[PDB]
Amino acid sequence: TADVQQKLAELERQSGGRLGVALINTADNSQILYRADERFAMCSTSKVMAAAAVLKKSESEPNLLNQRVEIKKSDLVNYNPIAEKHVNGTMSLAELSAAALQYSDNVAMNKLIAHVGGPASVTAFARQLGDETFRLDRTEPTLNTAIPGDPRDTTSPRAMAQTLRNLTLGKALGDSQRAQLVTWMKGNTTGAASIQAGLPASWVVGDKTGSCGYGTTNDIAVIWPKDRAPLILVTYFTQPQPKAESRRDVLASAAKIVTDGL
Ligand SMILES: [Cl-]
Protein backbone atom coordinates (compact mmCIF):
# COMPACT_ATOMS: atom_id res chain seq x y z
CA THR A 1 0.00 0.00 0.00
CA ALA A 2 0.92 3.65 -0.39
CA ASP A 3 0.25 3.74 3.35
CA VAL A 4 3.15 1.37 4.05
CA GLN A 5 5.35 3.37 1.67
CA GLN A 6 4.41 6.64 3.37
CA LYS A 7 5.14 5.14 6.79
CA LEU A 8 8.56 3.89 5.68
CA ALA A 9 9.42 7.26 4.14
CA GLU A 10 8.36 8.95 7.40
CA LEU A 11 10.49 6.57 9.46
CA GLU A 12 13.48 7.16 7.21
CA ARG A 13 13.04 10.94 7.44
CA GLN A 14 12.76 10.85 11.21
CA SER A 15 15.80 8.57 11.48
CA GLY A 16 18.07 11.01 9.63
CA GLY A 17 19.59 8.25 7.49
CA ARG A 18 18.95 6.00 4.49
CA LEU A 19 16.68 2.98 4.91
CA GLY A 20 16.39 -0.10 2.71
CA VAL A 21 13.65 -2.72 3.12
CA ALA A 22 12.61 -5.84 1.25
CA LEU A 23 9.87 -8.12 2.59
CA ILE A 24 8.90 -11.30 0.74
CA ASN A 25 5.60 -12.78 1.92
CA THR A 26 5.48 -16.43 0.85
CA ALA A 27 1.71 -16.57 1.55
CA ASP A 28 0.93 -14.76 -1.71
CA ASN A 29 4.38 -14.30 -3.30
CA SER A 30 4.23 -10.54 -2.76
CA GLN A 31 6.95 -8.04 -1.89
CA ILE A 32 7.19 -4.76 -0.01
CA LEU A 33 10.20 -2.75 -1.22
CA TYR A 34 11.81 0.52 -0.15
CA ARG A 35 15.13 1.57 -1.75
CA ALA A 36 15.31 -2.14 -2.45
CA ASP A 37 17.71 -1.77 -5.41
CA GLU A 38 20.12 0.60 -3.67
CA ARG A 39 23.38 -0.69 -2.20
CA PHE A 40 24.14 -0.81 1.53
CA ALA A 41 27.25 -2.06 3.32
CA MET A 42 26.38 -5.51 4.67
CA CYS A 43 28.51 -5.52 7.83
CA SER A 44 28.21 -8.91 9.56
CA THR A 45 25.06 -9.85 7.59
CA SER A 46 27.53 -11.20 5.01
CA LYS A 47 28.28 -14.04 7.46
CA VAL A 48 25.18 -15.84 6.16
CA MET A 49 26.57 -16.06 2.61
CA ALA A 50 29.97 -17.29 3.87
CA ALA A 51 28.41 -19.98 6.09
CA ALA A 52 26.15 -21.04 3.22
CA ALA A 53 29.17 -21.33 0.91
CA VAL A 54 30.82 -23.69 3.42
CA LEU A 55 27.57 -25.69 3.70
CA LYS A 56 27.37 -25.97 -0.09
CA LYS A 57 30.97 -27.22 -0.23
CA SER A 58 30.13 -29.77 2.47
CA GLU A 59 27.53 -31.40 0.20
CA SER A 60 30.41 -33.09 -1.65
CA GLU A 61 32.85 -33.30 1.30
CA PRO A 62 31.18 -35.15 4.20
CA ASN A 63 34.11 -34.61 6.58
CA LEU A 64 34.12 -30.87 5.98
CA LEU A 65 32.10 -29.57 8.93
CA ASN A 66 34.25 -31.67 11.28
CA GLN A 67 37.55 -30.34 9.85
CA ARG A 68 39.69 -28.68 12.51
CA VAL A 69 41.03 -25.13 12.11
CA GLU A 70 43.82 -23.75 14.28
CA ILE A 71 43.10 -20.49 16.12
CA LYS A 72 46.22 -18.37 16.66
CA LYS A 73 46.84 -14.96 18.21
CA SER A 74 47.57 -13.78 14.67
CA ASP A 75 43.98 -14.69 13.73
CA LEU A 76 42.42 -12.27 16.22
CA VAL A 77 40.72 -9.23 14.71
CA ASN A 78 38.43 -6.60 16.20
CA TYR A 79 35.65 -8.75 17.73
CA ASN A 80 36.36 -12.37 18.67
CA PRO A 81 33.96 -13.42 21.45
CA ILE A 82 34.18 -17.17 20.77
CA ALA A 83 37.56 -17.51 19.04
CA GLU A 84 39.42 -15.71 21.82
CA LYS A 85 38.50 -18.65 24.07
CA HIS A 86 40.16 -21.16 21.68
CA VAL A 87 43.54 -19.56 20.99
CA ASN A 88 46.25 -22.24 20.46
CA GLY A 89 43.67 -24.97 19.94
CA THR A 90 41.37 -25.82 17.04
CA MET A 91 37.70 -25.30 16.23
CA SER A 92 35.74 -27.26 13.68
CA LEU A 93 34.19 -25.57 10.67
CA ALA A 94 30.77 -26.31 12.20
CA GLU A 95 31.82 -24.53 15.40
CA LEU A 96 33.16 -21.58 13.40
CA SER A 97 29.92 -21.39 11.43
CA ALA A 98 27.88 -21.35 14.66
CA ALA A 99 30.18 -18.73 16.22
CA ALA A 100 29.92 -16.49 13.15
CA LEU A 101 26.16 -16.79 12.86
CA GLN A 102 25.16 -16.83 16.55
CA TYR A 103 27.77 -14.53 18.15
CA SER A 104 28.97 -12.55 15.12
CA ASP A 105 32.55 -13.74 15.71
CA ASN A 106 34.83 -12.11 13.13
CA VAL A 107 37.64 -14.67 13.36
CA ALA A 108 35.03 -17.29 12.54
CA MET A 109 33.97 -15.30 9.47
CA ASN A 110 37.58 -15.06 8.31
CA LYS A 111 38.02 -18.82 8.63
CA LEU A 112 34.86 -19.46 6.61
CA ILE A 113 36.07 -16.99 3.97
CA ALA A 114 39.56 -18.51 3.84
CA HIS A 115 38.28 -22.06 3.62
CA VAL A 116 36.19 -21.48 0.49
CA GLY A 117 38.95 -19.49 -1.26
CA GLY A 118 38.46 -15.88 -0.15
CA PRO A 119 36.02 -13.03 -0.74
CA ALA A 120 35.90 -13.61 -4.51
CA SER A 121 34.91 -17.22 -3.89
CA VAL A 122 32.08 -16.22 -1.55
CA THR A 123 30.97 -13.78 -4.24
CA ALA A 124 31.21 -16.46 -6.96
CA PHE A 125 28.96 -18.68 -4.81
CA ALA A 126 26.36 -15.92 -4.68
CA ARG A 127 26.60 -15.65 -8.47
CA GLN A 128 26.08 -19.42 -8.84
CA LEU A 129 22.81 -19.05 -6.91
CA GLY A 130 21.59 -16.29 -9.24
CA ASP A 131 22.50 -13.30 -7.00
CA GLU A 132 24.28 -10.86 -9.31
CA THR A 133 24.26 -8.03 -6.71
CA PHE A 134 26.07 -9.34 -3.62
CA ARG A 135 29.74 -8.46 -3.44
CA LEU A 136 32.11 -9.49 -0.65
CA ASP A 137 35.31 -7.56 -1.43
CA ARG A 138 37.30 -7.71 1.80
CA THR A 139 37.83 -9.84 4.89
CA GLU A 140 37.17 -8.88 8.52
CA PRO A 141 37.59 -6.28 9.84
CA THR A 142 38.04 -3.95 6.87
CA LEU A 143 34.73 -4.99 5.24
CA ASN A 144 33.04 -2.77 7.89
CA THR A 145 34.17 0.69 6.68
CA ALA A 146 30.73 1.38 5.11
CA ILE A 147 31.83 4.62 3.42
CA PRO A 148 28.86 6.29 1.66
CA GLY A 149 29.04 5.71 -2.07
CA ASP A 150 31.59 2.89 -1.78
CA PRO A 151 30.22 -0.31 -3.43
CA ARG A 152 32.68 -2.62 -1.66
CA ASP A 153 31.08 -5.24 0.59
CA THR A 154 27.52 -4.20 -0.31
CA THR A 155 24.31 -5.71 -1.56
CA SER A 156 20.75 -4.51 -2.12
CA PRO A 157 17.71 -5.34 0.05
CA ARG A 158 15.92 -7.01 -2.88
CA ALA A 159 18.87 -9.25 -3.72
CA MET A 160 19.60 -10.29 -0.14
CA ALA A 161 15.94 -11.05 0.56
CA GLN A 162 15.63 -13.19 -2.57
CA THR A 163 18.89 -14.99 -1.79
CA LEU A 164 17.98 -15.53 1.87
CA ARG A 165 14.67 -17.02 0.71
CA ASN A 166 16.57 -19.43 -1.55
CA LEU A 167 18.98 -20.37 1.26
CA THR A 168 16.47 -20.90 4.07
CA LEU A 169 13.17 -21.81 2.35
CA GLY A 170 14.26 -22.78 -1.17
CA LYS A 171 16.67 -25.32 -2.63
CA ALA A 172 20.05 -23.55 -2.75
CA LEU A 173 21.30 -26.08 -0.18
CA GLY A 174 20.61 -29.76 0.30
CA ASP A 175 18.02 -30.68 2.89
CA SER A 176 20.57 -31.40 5.61
CA GLN A 177 22.52 -28.22 4.91
CA ARG A 178 19.41 -26.03 4.68
CA ALA A 179 18.15 -27.36 8.00
CA GLN A 180 21.56 -26.70 9.54
CA LEU A 181 21.58 -23.08 8.32
CA VAL A 182 18.05 -22.52 9.65
CA THR A 183 18.93 -24.05 13.03
CA TRP A 184 22.03 -21.87 13.29
CA MET A 185 20.08 -18.70 12.44
CA LYS A 186 17.21 -19.57 14.81
CA GLY A 187 19.85 -19.88 17.54
CA ASN A 188 21.22 -16.39 16.96
CA THR A 189 21.90 -14.60 20.23
CA THR A 190 22.37 -11.06 18.85
CA GLY A 191 19.06 -10.13 17.19
CA ALA A 192 16.49 -9.41 19.88
CA ALA A 193 16.76 -5.60 19.53
CA SER A 194 16.43 -5.54 15.73
CA ILE A 195 13.73 -7.14 13.52
CA GLN A 196 12.52 -9.32 16.42
CA ALA A 197 11.78 -6.19 18.49
CA GLY A 198 9.17 -5.14 15.88
CA LEU A 199 7.32 -8.48 15.74
CA PRO A 200 4.91 -10.14 18.17
CA ALA A 201 6.62 -12.17 20.90
CA SER A 202 5.12 -15.44 19.62
CA TRP A 203 6.70 -15.28 16.15
CA VAL A 204 9.74 -17.43 15.44
CA VAL A 205 12.77 -15.78 13.85
CA GLY A 206 16.09 -16.80 12.40
CA ASP A 207 18.16 -13.71 11.70
CA LYS A 208 21.64 -12.26 11.31
CA THR A 209 22.42 -8.71 12.40
CA GLY A 210 25.32 -6.42 11.53
CA SER A 211 26.46 -2.96 12.57
CA CYS A 212 29.45 -1.10 11.14
CA GLY A 213 30.75 2.28 10.01
CA TYR A 214 28.58 5.36 9.48
CA GLY A 215 26.10 3.99 11.98
CA THR A 216 25.17 1.21 9.59
CA THR A 217 22.67 -1.07 11.33
CA ASN A 218 21.32 -4.13 9.52
CA ASP A 219 19.31 -7.32 9.98
CA ILE A 220 18.21 -10.11 7.62
CA ALA A 221 15.65 -12.62 8.77
CA VAL A 222 13.45 -15.58 8.02
CA ILE A 223 10.22 -15.31 10.03
CA TRP A 224 7.51 -17.84 10.91
CA PRO A 225 4.46 -15.89 12.10
CA LYS A 226 1.97 -17.83 14.19
CA ASP A 227 -0.07 -20.02 11.80
CA ARG A 228 1.11 -18.20 8.68
CA ALA A 229 3.37 -18.85 5.72
CA PRO A 230 6.93 -17.65 6.35
CA LEU A 231 8.30 -14.23 5.52
CA ILE A 232 11.76 -13.06 4.49
CA LEU A 233 12.69 -9.57 5.70
CA VAL A 234 15.82 -7.48 5.07
CA THR A 235 16.19 -4.13 6.85
CA TYR A 236 19.34 -2.12 6.03
CA PHE A 237 20.11 1.31 7.46
CA THR A 238 23.02 3.75 7.26
CA GLN A 239 23.72 7.30 8.40
CA PRO A 240 25.60 10.38 7.23
CA GLN A 241 28.06 10.72 10.09
CA PRO A 242 31.19 8.54 10.35
CA LYS A 243 30.77 8.01 14.11
CA ALA A 244 26.98 7.68 14.15
CA GLU A 245 25.63 5.25 16.73
CA SER A 246 23.65 2.14 15.87
CA ARG A 247 19.88 2.47 15.45
CA ARG A 248 18.46 -1.03 15.96
CA ASP A 249 15.15 0.63 16.87
CA VAL A 250 14.83 1.83 13.25
CA LEU A 251 14.97 -1.80 12.09
CA ALA A 252 12.33 -2.78 14.65
CA SER A 253 10.10 0.09 13.50
CA ALA A 254 10.47 -0.92 9.84
CA ALA A 255 9.65 -4.54 10.71
CA LYS A 256 6.50 -3.45 12.54
CA ILE A 257 5.40 -1.23 9.64
CA VAL A 258 5.74 -3.94 7.00
CA THR A 259 4.17 -6.77 9.03
CA ASP A 260 1.24 -4.84 10.53
CA GLY A 261 -1.98 -6.59 9.63
CA LEU A 262 -0.36 -9.99 9.17
CL1 LIG B 1 30.81 11.84 13.29
Residue numbers in the entry: 27 to 288
What did the original publication write about this model?
CTX-M-15 (cefotaximase-Munich-15) is a class A extended-spectrum β-lactamase (ESBL) capable of hydrolyzing penicillins and cephalosporins, including third- and fourth-generation cephalosporins such as ceftazidime and cefepime, respectively. It is predominantly plasmid mediated, disseminated worldwide, and encountered in diverse Gram-negative pathogens, mostly Enterobacterales, but occasionally also in nonfermenters. CTX-M-15, like other class A SBLs, employs an acylation-deacylation mechanism to hydrolyze β-lactam antibiotics, utilizing four invariant residues: Ser70, Lys73, Ser130, and Glu166. In this study, ultrahigh-resolution X-ray crystal structures and mass spectrometry revealed the mechanism of PAS inhibition of CTX-M-15, an extended-spectrum β-lactamase (ESBL) globally disseminated among Enterobacterales.
One possible explanation for this is the presence in KPC-2 of a Cys69-Cys238 disulfide bond, a distinguishing feature of carbapenem-hydrolyzing class A enzymes. To test whether a disulfide could prevent cross-link formation, we constructed a CTX-M-15 Gly238Cys mutation (CTX-M-15G238C) which already contains a Cys residue at position 69 and used mass spectrometry to investigate whether this mutant could support cross-link formation. Formation of a Cys69-Cys238 disulfide was confirmed by determining the crystal structures of both mutants. Neither mutant prevented cross-link formation, as evidenced by the presence of a peak corresponding to a mass loss of 18-Da on 24 h of exposure to tazobactam or enmetazobactam. Thus, presence of an active-site disulfide bond is not sufficient to abolish cross-link formation by CTX-M-15 and does not account for the absence of cross-link formation in KPC-2. As a further investigation of the importance of active-site movement to cross-link formation, we sought to constrain the CTX-M-15 active site through introduction of the equivalent disulfide by directed mutagenesis. This, however, did not affect the ability of mutant enzymes CTX-M-15G238C and CTX-M-15G238C/G239_Y240insA to form cross-links, indicating that differences in disulfide content (and possibly a concurrent reduction in active site flexibility) are not the explanation for the differing abilities of CTX-M-15 and KPC-2 to support cross-link formation.
